[PDB]
C-alpha cells in the first residue's frame, strides 16, 4: 500500500490514541525501504515511544507491587510471570525498532540531522532493554546504548548547532542514560551543563520558533541538572 495511505492511517491512529496501529503502520512505511520525511520520521518516533512507554509503566508498576509484602506464594508467582510477560513484550517492541534502525533507517539516513536522530533512538531502545535485562545480556545492552548515543553525539558536535533540538534532545537522554542506567550523577550533570551552556552562548542569534522547541528541551536539561545536584 502507498506510504500516503499508511501515513494517513497512522495519523488517524494517532488522534484515535491507538498507537499499536500507528506504529504498525509507520513500520510498514519504513520497510518500503525509502528515507522518511521529517514528518514520517516523527510519526514513527512518536508511535513507538507510546507503544513502549505503556509496557514500561506497566512493567514498573508490577515491579513496585512485586516489591510489596506479599504472602500468597501464588500471588507472588503470578506477579513474576506477569512482570516477565510484560518484559518479553517490552523486549519485542525494542528489537523491532532496533531492527528497523539497523536494517532500514540508519543506513538509508542521508542528512546529518537524520543520522544523529536515529542513533539517539538506537541508544534509547537499548536503554529500554537494559532496564529489563538480566545476567550477561544486561552488560551487552547497556554498552550498545552508549555506543549509539556516543556515535550520535560526535556527529551532532560536528554537524549541528548547540541549540539544534535534535542535539539538545540527544544531550538530554544521554545525560539521563548516565544517571539512571550507569548510576553516575557526575557524568549526567557534566553532559547536561555543557549541552546547556553551549546553547545559551548562541541562543540570542536564533529567535522565535527555532527557539521554542530548543528552550523546552533546555528546560528539561535544567530540571534534571538541579534535581540531580540536590
Amino acid at each position: 500500500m502507498d506510504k500516503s495511505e499508511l501515513v494517513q492511517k497512522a495519523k488517524l491512529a494517532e488522534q484515535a490514541e491507538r498507537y499499536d496501529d500507528m506504529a504498525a503502520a509507520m513500520k510498514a512505511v519504513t520497510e518500503q525501504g525509502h528515507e522518511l520525511s521529517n514528518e514520517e520520521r516523527n510519526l514513527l518516533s512518536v508511535a513507538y515511544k507510546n507503544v513502549v512507554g505503556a509496557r514500561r509503566s506497566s512493567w514498573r508498576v508490577i515491579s513496585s507491587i512485586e516489591q510489596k509484602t506479599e504472602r500468597n506464594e501464588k500471588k507472588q508467582q503470578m506477579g513474576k510471570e506477569y512482570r516477565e510477560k510484560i518484559e518479553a513484550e517490552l523486549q519485542d517492541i525494542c528489537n523491532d525498532v532496533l531492527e528497523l534502525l539497523d536494517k532500514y533507517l540508519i543506513p538509508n539516513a542521508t542528512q546529518p540531522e537524520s543520522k544523529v536522530f536515529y542513533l539517539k533512538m538506537k541508544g534509547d531502545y537499548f536503554r529500554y532493554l537494559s532496564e529489563v535485562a538480566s545476567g550477561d545480556n544486561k552488560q551487552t545492552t547497556v554498552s550498545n546504548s552508549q555506543q549509539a548515543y556516543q556515535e550520535a553525539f560526535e556527529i551532532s558536535k560536528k554537524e549541528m548547532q548547540p541549540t539544534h533540538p535534535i542535539r539538545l534532545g540527544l544531550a538530554l537522554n544521554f545525560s539521563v542514560f548516565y544517571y539512571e542506567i550507569l548510576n553516575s550523577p557526575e557524568k549526567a550533570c557534566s553532559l547536561a551543563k555543557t549541552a546547556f551552556d553551549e546553547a545559551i552562548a548562541e541562543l540570542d542569534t536564533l529567535n522565535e520558533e527555532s527557539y521554542k522547541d530548543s528552550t523546552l528541551i533546555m528546560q528539561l536539561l535544567r530540571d534534571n541538572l538541579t534535581l540531580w545536584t540536590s
Binding site: 537522554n173 539521563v176 544517571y179 528539561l220 534534571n224
Partner: peptide
C-alpha cells in the same frame, strides 16, 4: 527525570 520524543 524528563526527556523528549
Amino acid at each position: 527525570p524528563v526527556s523528549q520524543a
